[PDB]
Design an enzyme around this catalytic site. Structure first.
Site, PDB file in Angstrom:
ATOM      1  CG  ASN A  37     -14.389  25.037   9.750  1.00 21.75           C
ATOM      2  OD1 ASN A  37     -13.825  24.160  10.415  1.00 21.75           O
ATOM      3  ND2 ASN A  37     -15.100  25.994  10.305  1.00 21.75           N
ATOM      4  CB  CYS A  45      -6.828  27.702  16.443  1.00 26.27           C
ATOM      5  SG  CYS A  45      -7.631  26.557  17.723  1.00 26.27           S
ATOM      6  CG  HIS A  56     -14.950  32.738  13.345  1.00 23.67           C
ATOM      7  ND1 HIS A  56     -14.555  31.542  12.781  1.00 23.67           N
ATOM      8  CD2 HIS A  56     -15.351  33.526  12.315  1.00 23.67           C
ATOM      9  CE1 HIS A  56     -14.720  31.600  11.469  1.00 23.67           C
ATOM     10  NE2 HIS A  56     -15.204  32.793  11.159  1.00 23.67           N
ATOM     11  CG  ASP A  95     -14.869  33.800   8.161  1.00 22.96           C
ATOM     12  OD1 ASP A  95     -14.482  32.790   8.786  1.00 22.96           O
ATOM     13  OD2 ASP A  95     -15.890  34.422   8.491  1.00 22.96           O
TER      14      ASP A  95
END
Length: 330
Positions: free
Chosen positions: A8, A13, A248, A265
């Site tokens: 991250n 996006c 998310h 994720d």
């Protein structure tokens, strides 16, 4: 799990989601490794930056970063990715990659995997003129608003549009004319990228929308072919949770095409049930749903997901990235 995540590093996006999707396009990964980057400048090479990410994703134990990649193609500001969609990113990347593969031995790996053929026609009604023009596509934008499932979106995509009134078609010598306009499919690629138009002018639709594990597309082809029907296997589900502003982004993949799904994720990759990859992303009466789907043509599954090895990576590439690691460790 066997696979590593991506870091991250800001509001990129859909990016990390797309990178895992491409990385598990094992046929595509091997081509990307062959590109002639030996003489490139890291600070500016998109083709090299994607080699790095994939190499890291194939070997690193720890979440992989992307900063050299976002620097390469210039999407570096706070909202850079909030001002584009996946489809723009995917085309920016692959087109940057193919232009580097040109004049090389892997020229044309992208259209082989991703490009299909369409015909768009305008057929006059009261007059006998027709205009047939073939178009290539690398992905399909499917409308979801008021459609139950992917079959209806395909139904709507090939539905005839009428040209009449203030809208009549310029038939040239025949003057203005009433006509019909639509598209048919000539060919469907081995790897099929379907964007699901939840994000429109600037809002997100969260209505229920169903897609299958097995996607039979023969009936939208102009002429079909036995020994190669258009049967398609769901490989990736790119998911967004929330509304238009903020959310998310996650991706579900069964990377081997064997029905064993994991959830990616950013830096956490876990196994999940099939129902969580598929039906739980249909949307409806919450805000967690699919905006992009990746299908692989069943006949080409084995080949598209061919196993990649450390041997499939050129030594001179391996060398360049390692010295990059070492310099960084100081």
């Amino acid at each position: 799990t066997g696979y590593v995540g991506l870091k991250n590093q800001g509001a990129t996006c859909y990016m990390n989601s797309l990178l895992q999707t491409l990385f598990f396009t094992n046929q595509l990964r091997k081509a990307v490794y062959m590109m002639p980057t030996e003489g490139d400048d890291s600070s500016k090479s998109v083709p090299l930056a994607l080699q790095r990410v994939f190499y890291e994703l194939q070997h690193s134990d720890k979440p992989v970063g992307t900063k050299k990649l976002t620097k390469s193609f210039g999407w570096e500001t706070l909202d850079s990715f909030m001002q584009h969609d996946v489809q723009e990113l995917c085309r920016k990347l692959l087109d940057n990659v193919e232009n580097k593969m040109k004049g090389t031995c892997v020229e044309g790996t992208i259209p082989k995997l991703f490009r299909g053929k369409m015909v768009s026609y305008i057929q006059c009604k009261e007059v006998d003129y027709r205009s047939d023009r073939r178009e290539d596509y690398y992905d399909i934008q499917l409308s979801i608003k008021g459609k139950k499932n992917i079959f209806e979106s395909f139904v709507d995509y090939v539905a005839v549009e009428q040209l009449d009134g203030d809208n009549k078609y310029d038939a040239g010598e025949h003057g203005l004319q009433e006509a019909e306009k639509g598209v048919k499919f000539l060919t469907l690629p081995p790897v099929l990228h379907l964007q699901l138009m939840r994000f429109m002018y600037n809002i997100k639709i969260n209505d229920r929308f169903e897609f299958p594990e097995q996607l039979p597309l023969d009936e939208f082809l102009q002429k079909t072919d036995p020994k190669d029907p258009a049967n398609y296997i769901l490989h990736a589900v790119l998911v967004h949770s929330g509304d238009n502003h903020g959310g998310h982004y996650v991706v579900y993949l069964n990377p081997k095409g064997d029905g064993k799904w994991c959830k990616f994720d950013d830096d956490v990759v876990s196994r999940c049930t099939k129902e969580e990859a598929i039906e739980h992303n249909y949307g409806g009466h919450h805000c967690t749903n699919a905006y992009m789907l990746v299908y692989i043509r069943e006949s080409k599954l084995s080949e598209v997901l061919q196993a990649v090895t450390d041997h499939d990576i050129p030594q001179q590439l391996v060398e360049r990235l390692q010295e990059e690691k070492r310099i960084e460790a100081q």
